Amino acid sequence: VNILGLTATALFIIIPTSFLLILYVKTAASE
Amino acid sequence: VNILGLTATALFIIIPTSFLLILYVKTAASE
Amino acid sequence: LLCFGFGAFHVTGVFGPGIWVSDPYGLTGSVQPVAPSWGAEGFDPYNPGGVPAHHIAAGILGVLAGLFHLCVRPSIRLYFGLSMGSIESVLSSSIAAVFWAAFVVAGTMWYGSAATPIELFGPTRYQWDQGFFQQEIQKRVAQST
Amino acid sequence: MEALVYTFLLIGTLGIIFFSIFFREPPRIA
Amino acid sequence: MLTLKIFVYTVVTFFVGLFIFGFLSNDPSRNPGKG
Amino acid sequence: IGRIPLWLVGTVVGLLAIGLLAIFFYGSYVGLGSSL
Amino acid sequence: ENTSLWARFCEWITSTENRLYIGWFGVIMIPTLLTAISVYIIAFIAAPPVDIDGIREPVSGSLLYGNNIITGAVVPTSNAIGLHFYPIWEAASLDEWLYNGGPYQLVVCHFFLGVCCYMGREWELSYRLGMRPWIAVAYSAPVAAATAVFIIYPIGQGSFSDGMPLGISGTFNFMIVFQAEHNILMHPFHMFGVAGVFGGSLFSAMHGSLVTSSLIRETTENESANAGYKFGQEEETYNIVAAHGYFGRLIFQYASFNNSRSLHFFLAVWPVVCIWLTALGISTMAFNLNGFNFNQSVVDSNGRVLNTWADIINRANLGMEVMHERNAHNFPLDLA
Amino acid sequence: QRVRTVLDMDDPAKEETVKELRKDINN
Amino acid sequence: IFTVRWLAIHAIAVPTIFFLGAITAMQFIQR
Amino acid sequence: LGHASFKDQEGRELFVRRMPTFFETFPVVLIDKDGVVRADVPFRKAESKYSIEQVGVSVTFYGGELNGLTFTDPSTVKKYARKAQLGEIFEFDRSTLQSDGVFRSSPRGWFTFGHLSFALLFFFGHIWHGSRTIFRDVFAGIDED
Amino acid sequence: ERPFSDILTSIRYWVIHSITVPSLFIAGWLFVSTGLAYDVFGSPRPNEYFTEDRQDAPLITDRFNALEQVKKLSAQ
Amino acid sequence: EPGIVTPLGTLLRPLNSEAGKVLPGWGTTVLMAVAILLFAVFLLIILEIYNSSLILDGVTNSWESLA
Amino acid sequence: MARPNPNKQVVELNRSSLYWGLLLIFVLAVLFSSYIFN
Amino acid sequence: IGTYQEKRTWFDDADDWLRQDRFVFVGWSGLLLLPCAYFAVGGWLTGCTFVTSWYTHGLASSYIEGCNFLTAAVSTPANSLGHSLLFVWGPEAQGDLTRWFQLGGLWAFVALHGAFGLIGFMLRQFEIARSVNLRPYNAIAFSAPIAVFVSVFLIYPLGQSGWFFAPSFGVASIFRFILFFQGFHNWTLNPFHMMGVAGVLGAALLCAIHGATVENTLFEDGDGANTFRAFNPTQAEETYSMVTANRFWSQIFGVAFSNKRWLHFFMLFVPVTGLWMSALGVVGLALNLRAYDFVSQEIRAAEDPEFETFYTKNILLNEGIRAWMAAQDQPHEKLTLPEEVLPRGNAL
Amino acid sequence: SVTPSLKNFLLSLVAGAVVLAAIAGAVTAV
Ligand code: CLA
Ligand code: CLA
Ligand code: CLA
Ligand SMILES: C=Cc1c(C)c2cc3nc(c4c5[nH]c(cc6nc(cc1[nH]2)C(C)=C6CC)c(C)c5C(=O)[C@@H]4C(=O)OC)[C@@H](CCC(=O)OC/C=C(\C)CCC[C@H](C)CCC[C@H](C)CCCC(C)C)[C@@H]3C
Ligand SMILES: CC(C)=CCC/C(C)=C/CC/C(C)=C/CC/C(C)=C/CC/C(C)=C/CC/C(C)=C/CC/C(C)=C/CC/C(C)=C/CC/C(C)=C/CC1=CC(=O)C(C)=C(C)C1=O
Ligand SMILES: CCCCCCCCCCCCCCCCCC(=O)OC[C@H](COP(=O)(O)O)OC(=O)CCCCCCCCCCCCCCCCC
Ligand SMILES: CC1=C(/C=C/C(C)=C/C=C/C(C)=C/C=C/C=C(C)/C=C/C=C(C)/C=C/C2=C(C)CCCC2(C)C)C(C)(C)CCC1
Ligand SMILES: CC1=C(/C=C/C(C)=C/C=C/C(C)=C/C=C/C=C(C)/C=C/C=C(C)/C=C/C2=C(C)CCCC2(C)C)C(C)(C)CCC1
Ligand code: OEX
Ligand SMILES: [Cl-]
Ligand SMILES: [Cl-]
Ligand SMILES: [Fe+2]
Ligand code: NA
């Protein structure tokens, strides 16, 4: 719907992006 | 409201939590 | 032990409450104690009596096979063949058993059984396809006419 | 509202493409 | 609209002329090969 | 071992295969399945 | 002479040190593709409805007019225009240009020029790098397919309204109407194209699996196996002999590729030639040559038609056929 | 009571009904 | 004979030639 | 709303052909006792031979909130035949939840879909882990000798 | 073993197969032309797709007596 | 160095003390194969009952079995 | 083994894998957003 | 086995003979693969040559009926048989082989033997890779064809009313199946199918590109104009410049592979992932859980007669497909639809 | 007692045992 689909899309964007950014920033600081 | 407050609360939790987790995980990988 | 207890005390109503049992047309269903069916009708999927009989018999077999596996060590040939020293072999066989069970429960839910009542899960598509409720309604109208 | 979401998703995909091209990890020949 | 057509004709002619005289500018000599 | 050349064998086999294909294509215009 | 203006421009254009190569094919590719990209994005977002069928019944197409990403499209040019060239300056107003499908024609023409110059640019960089030149030949097959669906089929059918709409659901509409009018499924060239895409998937997975299966142990289990390859290492990272032996034991000994050169060629040639064939099939159905017609081919001894799977396909085609352009036909035959 | 009538009455509404699909070799 | 090679060849070849004769005969069935 | 019985001007009883499970949309067809189509809602309301107006179809409801009521106007006979295409006719409150008028799936359908998808994904997982177990010593690569 | 090009170039192969292969071809031809194919596989001959009783396509429409009904609907 | 000793761990220690202990030869593999084939036959029986490929006297194989 | 856990391993994610993951997430969002909004 | 006595049994002799290297490797998986695959292929050829579909579908489907290679098919049983296994000894055929052929039992024969043959071929991949000590990525990649076969030929008809709605083994019958999914499910609109199409097309692109990139970045390595003679199988160094390939594709397309490993894997990964996504979508279609309509656009179209999109056009086309296909395609439904209810356009 | 379906099922089990014995004999026939 207009807003439940909105929060679904926002969460599906942000949570895996958060996971990927955590791993990448950790890696790039490591190297 | 019922759902706009819901997405506001979810974003206010997750985005600063993501920022803090990024910084903490890179720091802890750097011990 | 757990399967035998669930089949002999819960679903029989000996100590537990039984399971949900309904009429064939989903009108007067309720949670009832269920007597086991030890004949060929016990393998009727829509017979509620098959569930306690299965659980009692399979629990007894599971207890006996567990005692066997407590006692008897595996052979060297089968140990090396199935890699019984590696936990990932157990993971592969467990995943195999789990998707076998998932296929079984998906088919059972889709085609209907005694364990998937229509008063709880809704009608099946085959009851519409084969005119189940339509046939019952028209038979009840033909009677009393 | 939904048009905003569609446009934002497309533009974000194009931004990821831009970054993957011009800010890639360079292939090192050693 | 005629101003737009004039501008587009100028742009297309410019790029086509660049293409043509670029391949006229000794292009078979611009390679890393021996020969 | 080697008596008849393999190229001649392949030529005869290919001729037979082409002939069978031509017969099958001819049968598309005659008999059953020929719309007539 | 490194100082004259044209020579400096030439050495910049043909430079192999720019991040993206330009070249003389690029000096046409970049402006045409940028024009096409700009117009496509703007039209996909905010274009007003287009009277595609020329029957004063416009099709919206754009997100701002209630479409999503799936159903949004740049709608083909009006059927009233047909094959006529319709630039912006040939319209009285931008609104008329938009109502009659001008953005589609602009994007299609610029995209065609851009992909032709992309192929030329691929050749040009291969020549500037000392490579062999046939990556452009490989790329000619998707270029042929795009040209067939955007230019050649409209030419054969007489109208750019018959081009593939620049969209997802528009692509599906193009496919369904194409099947209804030409029976593309029963076309051997399309069968070759399907064999090519299925074989390309099969052979990509098999190459891949094979190279991956024969990877030489250079890493540990806590690392990625890709870490066993270094960029620019001289040695081979896999055992081609072991992979070939596995493939020979799996299928047949002498039917396996013992030459990596020959294998790569096969991998290159198979989907490329099959996509060539299916693009030519689209281009030949542009002139109404169509797939195999086996309707009422089988009849009994009394002459009664025995229906086949071809007849069932024909029923489906009739279903698509009597429904497409529901208001655009005044005469029974679909000659246009 | 009239199984033939209930059969011929379920049939036009639904031809896939099991009463129509069962024992119809006799028909 | 009677090898795996021979048997694998013949299990395909003998029905293939039989079926080819059958289909060739079908080509001359005048309804 | 009660069972809907359809009749024509001649007085023979007609039945709406029920929608099969595949069809998102289904034409409204009224068939007599002997399997002959007697009425329909035509797509082409010109040179038609079986429309509700031409055949003169009335509908009578028995047993529900419309019991005893008979409708003869074609505009209402058409809508009741279109509803009888879906089976027994009910009245629905749509304002409470803002229903969109399109059918949903049952919990048994959702269960079956989720578990069949999980079953295939777990078949892949079982393949992957059996592969990992059997081919552990070559997991990082082959022996090169 | 022995190479395929070795066997296919030998005359012993061809004196065996110039009589085995045409025998199989003729066997298939006679299998079709004698009606034995129709008898074995149940496909109708071109004249027996319809009977005087039914003039449309058969419908099995029964599972547990499908043998009896396909016997009834087949070409006697 | 040794592990952490707990009373429950000492109680459970004999149940995890015979890792790698196997029988010589094939052991009970023939009996296991017999059990496996019997289980396959049983699963085929119930599959054919629920597929209606196996028809029995008192097995209705329909919702009327709820009656 | 000892007081520290010997099975410690360090997770790694390079920039190419980050770009692939971001592309996967955003492309999945693009593909499925029309269906989620319905 | 670890310098143990390991007294030989019949199993060791059987394994020694089964895993011996011959022209056709058998192995332990051969005892499943060769009979099942042979019977599936031979049954399909036999059905397309001789067996009719006149009683299950009312269709001519064999060469002996006049069909060609495109229009011949081993067809599914009648829908009234449901999901019956159609054993030749089963309660339908009851031992009669000819009536078993007439009743559609050959379809179940071919499907089940082909499924077990696919299992046997995957086991063959596993066994040969274990014999030659290679990683089992070929079998891992072959898991996706088996997933497609299972979901399409078994799971979908099992979710539907019977094997009748499974694909019939044949060219035009597969085309029927495809057009049926279009009309009845809007399978193009399904995102899982979209991911499958993306995987298949991207894998074909990857195959072509690669092959072209390798063939055009070759090292000289010889003197002749035929480059295929400039490769030896035991050669230790690479045959193609990875560096030049990377430079070319980075300057043409913007990105390029720098890792050969990762590239071969990616070439493995794209088609397998696409086929698995499409299999999940077909599983969804088994329960009629389709991505058929966009409800907001349907609402807007119902409340606005001006609003037309290509999606609405495709919905109309699907309605036409279903209405004009149903009577001949589902004979068990016995649909005698008058032409006046068939949706049509104008004139045409 | 034994239905025709049950009798055919038991005979099918016998036939399956027979064909497994046959393929074992084909394996040992080499
Ligand atoms: C007194 C004896 C007794 C009684 C009366 C029962 C009664 C029952 N048992 Mg049984 N059972 C017993 C003792 C007993 N059992 C004992 C001693 C054992 C050994 C421990 C078992 C083991 C057992 C198993 C393992 C199964 C049952 C099942 C059943 C049910 C059969 C009807 C049904 O719904 O099947 C429906 C189920 C089937 C017909 C199974 C078909 C499985 C097929 C062959 C394979 C499916 C997966 C396959 C990989 C396909 C993949 C997908 C495909 C598209 C490719 C019923 C409740 C079944 C059950 O729980 O059903 C819900 C079941 O799976 N029993
Ligand atoms: C494509 C299918 C396939 C493939 C190739 C694999 C691959 C693997 N399996 Mg298997 N497996 C499968 C599906 C598959 N399996 C399924 C559907 C089941 C049931 C849940 C299992 C159960 C299973 C277990 C529990 C284990 C494995 C293991 C393994 C590994 C060792 C090889 C082995 O034991 O083969 C298994 C053998 C087969 C799949 C062949 C089965 C042939 C049967 C007997 C044919 C019977 C037909 C019969 C007439 C019935 C007809 C029914 C009809 C009427 C409906 C290997 C990685 C073992 C291992 O060591 O993992 C590390 C292990 O522990 N598998
Ligand atoms: C086996 C799993 C399972 C099953 C079968 C069900 C089934 C059900 N749940 Mg449920 N639930 C589950 C687990 C499950 N749930 C879990 C794990 C949660 C916690 C998150 C929930 C939370 C939940 C809520 C809170 C609600 C439901 C409701 C529903 C019902 C409505 C239909 C439905 O599922 O929505 C439709 C389902 C789908 C559209 C599935 C989506 C298809 C896949 C996942 C998309 C593929 C992934 C894709 C890449 C994602 C990208 C999208 C992005 C762009 C946004 C249905 C009976 C609803 C209801 O009626 O409540 C009473 C409801 O409001 N459930
Ligand atoms: C229509 C498409 C298609 C076909 C025909 C096909 C065919 C094949 N793929 C194989 C392999 C592979 N396929 C792979 C990936 C893929 N394969 C794909 C698509 C296909 N793959 C796709 C899209 C991918 C990407 C994921 C891999 C990774 C492999 C291999 O390793 C393997 C190989 O070596 O290839 C070189 C071969 C081994 C099969 C075999 O002998 O099993 C044994 C024979 C059996 C099981 C009999 C088949 C019975 C079938 C299931 C039912 C009966 C069908 C009838 C006989 C024919 C009906 C025909 C009509 C439908 C027209 C075989 C030639
Ligand atoms: C207004 C706007 C912007 C409008 C746009 C609207 C619009 C229509 C947008 C929608 C677009 C959109 C993103 C939709 C697609 C959604 C979709 C279907 C997603 C699928 C998602 C998915 C998970 C699919 C599963 C299958 C899968 C894994 C697919 C991946 C496909 C994939 C990326 C394939 C590769 C494609 C590709 C271009 C490869 C080139 C690789 C390459 C550079 C190799 C060259 C090369 C070769 C060599 O050999 C060597 C040696 C070297 C060195 C080398 O380099
Ligand atoms: C949320 C909002 C943010 C979203 C961000 C979206 C990002 C889109 C950026 C818009 C595109 C602008 C690119 C301009 C870059 C020029 C600099 C350059 O090319 O390097 C010079 C670089 C200079 O040589 P060097 O010494 O090697 O650095 O190489 C060149 O000379 C290449 C010249 C070609 C210029 C045309 C570039 C084509 C860009 C394609 C634009 C596509 C639009 C869609 C965007 C998605 C794809 C990216
Ligand atoms: C491809 C291939 C192959 C082959 C096959 C075949 C089978 C072929 C053939 C062929 C042929 C079979 C040929 C022939 C030819 C002939 C010619 C080329 C001729 C001629 C002449 C002329 C020119 C004529 C003239 C005339 C006239 C005009 C008139 C009348 C008289 C006369 C007749 C004299 C092989 C296996 C080896 C290898 C691989 C693949
Ligand atoms: C079903 C069944 C079974 C089985 C059987 C079998 C297994 C058999 C077979 C068989 C077979 C196995 C057959 C075959 C066939 C074949 C064919 C029919 C062929 C063909 C080919 C062709 C036609 C070719 C063409 C060509 C040429 C020559 C030229 C160029 C190339 C090409 C390729 C195009 C049993 C008894 C167990 C049981 C009962 C049922
Ligand atoms: O535009 Mn597209 O589809 Ca080739 O046909 Mn004429 O035009 Mn329209 O109609 Mn039919
Ligand atoms: Cl249209
Ligand atoms: Cl017209
Ligand atoms: Fe490669
Ligand atoms: Na029209």
Side-chain angles (χ1 to χ4, degrees), chain N residues 237-254:
Chain N
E237 83 284 358
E238 69 184 8
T239 227
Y240 80 89
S241 191
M242 188 68 202
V243 178
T244 309
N246 184 262
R247 176 90 169 202
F248 175 84
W249 284 118
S250 307
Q251 281 190 290
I252 288 290
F253 182 61

Side-chain angles (χ1 to χ4, degrees), chain G residues 53 79 153 157 159 161-162 177 181-182 324-325 328-329 334-336, chain N residues 348:
Chain G
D53 291 330
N79 184 71
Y153 190 67
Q157 300 300 298
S159 178
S161 64
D162 294 316
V177 174
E181 290 169 21
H182 304 291
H324 77 278
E325 277 99 317
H329 297 94
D334 205 355
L335 305 189
Chain N
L348 185 147

Side-chain angles (χ1 to χ4, degrees), chain C:
Chain C
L1 282 181
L2 195 52
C3 180
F4 176 81
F6 171 71
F9 305 117
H10 181 104
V11 309
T12 48
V14 173
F15 187 71
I19 53 165
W20 186 277
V21 164
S22 50
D23 63 316
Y25 303 101
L27 303 178
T28 51
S30 172
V31 169
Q32 297 290 110
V34 174
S37 301
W38 300 108
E41 76 283 341
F43 300 96
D44 196 320
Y46 297 94
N47 178 31
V51 170
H54 155 75
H55 284 92
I56 289 164
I60 291 166
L61 193 52
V63 166
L64 293 168
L67 290 170
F68 163 81
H69 281 101
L70 284 184
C71 203
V72 178
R73 296 301 304 178
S75 66
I76 179 172
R77 303 295 286 261
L78 187 58
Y79 188 92
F80 274 91
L82 284 196
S83 294
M84 301 186 180
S86 67
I87 187 73
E88 196 161 26
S89 193
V90 184
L91 181 53
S92 59
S93 48
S94 293
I95 290 172
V98 170
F99 76 82
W100 175 282
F103 274 127
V104 163
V105 301
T108 296
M109 179 75 69
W110 190 244
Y111 301 130
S113 76
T116 53
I118 63 164
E119 281 174 342
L120 308 187
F121 296 104
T124 70
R125 61 152 294 159
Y126 305 97
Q127 288 169 322
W128 173 265
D129 292 331
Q130 297 141 7
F132 191 64
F133 304 106
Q134 170 197 34
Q135 191 259 0
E136 176 61 28
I137 284 166
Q138 295 307 325
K139 200 176 82 167
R140 291 190 183 189
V141 167
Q143 211 75 36
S144 67
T145 287

Side-chain angles (χ1 to χ4, degrees), chain E residues 1-2 8 10-12 16-17 20-22 24-25 29 33 35:
Chain E
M1 283 306 186
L2 184 61
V8 168
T10 303
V11 164
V12 171
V16 165
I20 289 175
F21 291 103
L24 270 173
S25 307
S29 78

Side-chain angles (χ1 to χ4, degrees), chain N residues 12 23 35 68 80 97 138-139 149 174 176 193 202 218 234 250 255 260 266 288 337 342-343:
Chain N
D12 294 322
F23 173 70
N68 52 77
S80 62
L97 191 70
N138 189 225
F149 180 80
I174 288 296
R176 178 266 179 194
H193 182 242
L218 291 176
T234 62
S250 307
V255 289
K260 208 194 226 234
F266 192 74
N288 291 335
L337 293 172
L342 289 180

Side-chain angles (χ1 to χ4, degrees), chain K residues 28-68:
Chain K
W29 187 288
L30 296 183
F31 183 68
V32 169
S33 62
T34 49
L36 193 58
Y38 299 110
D39 292 331
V40 167
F41 299 100
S43 189
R45 291 172 186 81
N47 47 284
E48 44 192 29
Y49 274 88
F50 308 94
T51 61
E52 298 305 311
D53 287 331
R54 55 154 189 89
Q55 284 294 303
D56 44 2
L59 193 60
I60 289 306
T61 190
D62 197 5
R63 177 184 174 179
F64 297 100
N65 321 313
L67 178 56
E68 287 76 14

Side-chain angles (χ1 to χ4, degrees), chain G residues 173 177 323-325, chain N residues 313 317:
Chain G
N173 193 258
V177 174
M323 290 303 294
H324 77 278
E325 277 99 317
Chain N
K313 298 168 162 289
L317 292 170

